[PDB]
Design a protein around this nucleic acid. Sequence first.
DNA 1: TAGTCACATCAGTGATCAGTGGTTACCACTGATCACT
Length: 339
Amino acid sequence: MVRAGGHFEVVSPHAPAGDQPAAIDELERRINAGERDVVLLGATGTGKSATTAWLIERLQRPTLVMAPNKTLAAQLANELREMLPHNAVEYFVSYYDYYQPEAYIAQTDTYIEKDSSINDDVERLRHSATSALLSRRDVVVVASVSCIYGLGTPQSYLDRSVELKVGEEVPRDGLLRLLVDVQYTRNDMSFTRGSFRVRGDTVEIIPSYEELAVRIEFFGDEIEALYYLHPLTGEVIRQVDSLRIFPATHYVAGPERMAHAVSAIEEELAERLAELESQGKLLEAQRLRMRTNYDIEMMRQVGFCSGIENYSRHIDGRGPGTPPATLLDYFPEDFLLVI
DNA sequence: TAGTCACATCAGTGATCAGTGGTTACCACTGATCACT
């Protein structure tokens, strides 16, 4: 919802020539009338990312572009960063340099556990998408099919976290409660991702969306100053005053959202227990109950775990069969989609 | 048949730090025989 007015400016010398100007002009004339299905044909060696950038800059909408693999989306995002440097261009689905599914091969009867290799810049781009989508309008996000996978609702991502502005009377206890309510950990000697350095008047944080460090220095029970500093060295960058912080997860949830998630988890657990009792799957129901028992208590303690997406609906408050809350909800009703 | 799912816990796997654990006499007096009257 919150989207600062951004203008897409392209400095690349490449411009439409010959068939390209007429093609893009007709594309715009025939897109302005509201038809929901739009088919473009286009070969290689012509700058498809360039055409997407031209459409983006002459449409001025938050854009979600769609790619079916890595060796396309990665360089597409790099290009749209090149011709849109001021605007935020990032890669969302990503999350790995390599991955192994937590899947079940039925033919071999093999349950393979989840394995991840999270690149810091890759998850930086992902969380930059999920955050700047709710902080600015000039956002271009590239994603694979997992963009239609259910994350948390953008409403909670934008209003159930906290905003800090200089010279406000917010106690340290409330700050720590909100930090542990926005999925952050407790680490002092080193500075890792999503942990708070708490030393007297100094509270240093590393957002998931900005890999750098944010330091707030207190004066009593009222914050005195706020700055952007390097994580491990504390290098001064600039002077900032207002920061609407976002949690280290896309499944943001305040206390009442924990209540809603717990109630939904309980009701669907009862439904699934009844279904498995009717199906005669005693061992399966037991395994699910042990997994959910480990996956209920520590959400109301801190929240962050592996497999939180499997309960994402319970966080969102939606119903079965309804479209899951995805990156589309983060976009407004006037967003642009590219395939 | 392959690029999709979160910033997690394992269970040791298996060197180093650090509690403990033990270990190593100049004089001086009486002794005293043959030193003395």
